[PDB]
Design a protein around this ligand. Structure first.
Ligand SMILES: COC(=O)c1c(O)cc(O)c(C(=O)OC)c1CCc1nccn1Cc1ccccc1
Length: 208
């Protein structure tokens, strides 16, 4: 059906970004975090205390240069364990490959699959209201999900961790992330921060 139409759009956008410095993974990281924040703000209109777990609506990005990791943390609606298992309808549980999705592909396919332009794995730590906090890890093909051993550390929202390839080590430099976040967040209504350094003290720096 239209599942091939959205897949066609996804191939077009991901390969197009391969010419332009493979930056579409970061634009999608910011855009999807913004939509998740929009979702919980819409819910807070009906629910009185929908923000009781985390009363702030932010996007916070931190680089781990020595560990070669990229963290993007938003305080959006989050995802239940049942929502992590569904993901975007294309990732199966580990060991079950030999056994709608079109709407999930059209919205999240570009963001998920373009992350593997620079990352070997994609790890999702999410905390949704009325559910515990879980960790979800995928190799682009299969996934595995467990409950976070640390418990509820986000209050509410989602942290996307990208285990970057060494090929993409230059993305973790402060001046690189900051210029890229500033470019792709100038139209996001929510405040977006990057863990930056000032001389030496470290603190969140507003980028938009
Ligand atoms: C690939 O990271 C995301 O797309 C993503 C993000 O960057 C920031 C977020 O806050 C959230 C989020 O929690 O939205 C509530 C997501 C998940 C967006 C989503 N909502 C329903 C399905 N998906 C796609 C998906 C992909 C992999 C595993 C699970 C779900």
């Amino acid at each position: 059906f239209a599942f091939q139409a959205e897949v066609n759009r996804m191939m077009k956008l991901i390969i197009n970004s391969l010419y332009k410095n493979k930056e579409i993974f970061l634009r999608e990281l910011i855009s999807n975090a913004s939509d998740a924040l929009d979702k919980i703000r819409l819910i807070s209109l009906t629910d009185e205390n929908a923000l009781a777990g985390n009363e702030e609506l932010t996007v916070k990005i931190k680089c781990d240069k020595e560990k070669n990791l990229l963290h993007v943390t938003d305080t959006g609606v989050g995802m239940t364990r049942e929502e992590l298992v569904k993901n975007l309808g294309t990732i199966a549980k580990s060991g079950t490959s030999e056994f709608s999705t079109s709407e999930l592909i059209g919205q999240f396919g570009v963001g998920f699959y373009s992350a593997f332009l620079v990352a070997d794995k994609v790890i999702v730590t999410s905390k949704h209201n009325n559910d515990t906090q879980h960790i979800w890890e995928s190799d682009s093909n299969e996934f595995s999900v467990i409950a976070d051993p640390r418990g509820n550390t986000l209050g509410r929202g989602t942290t996307i961790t990208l285990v970057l390839k060494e090929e993409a080590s230059d993305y973790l430099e402060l001046d690189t992330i900051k210029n890229l976040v500033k470019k792709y967040s100038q139209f996001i209504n929510f405040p977006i921060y990057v863990w930056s350094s000032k001389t030496t003290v470290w603190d969140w720096e507003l980028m938009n």
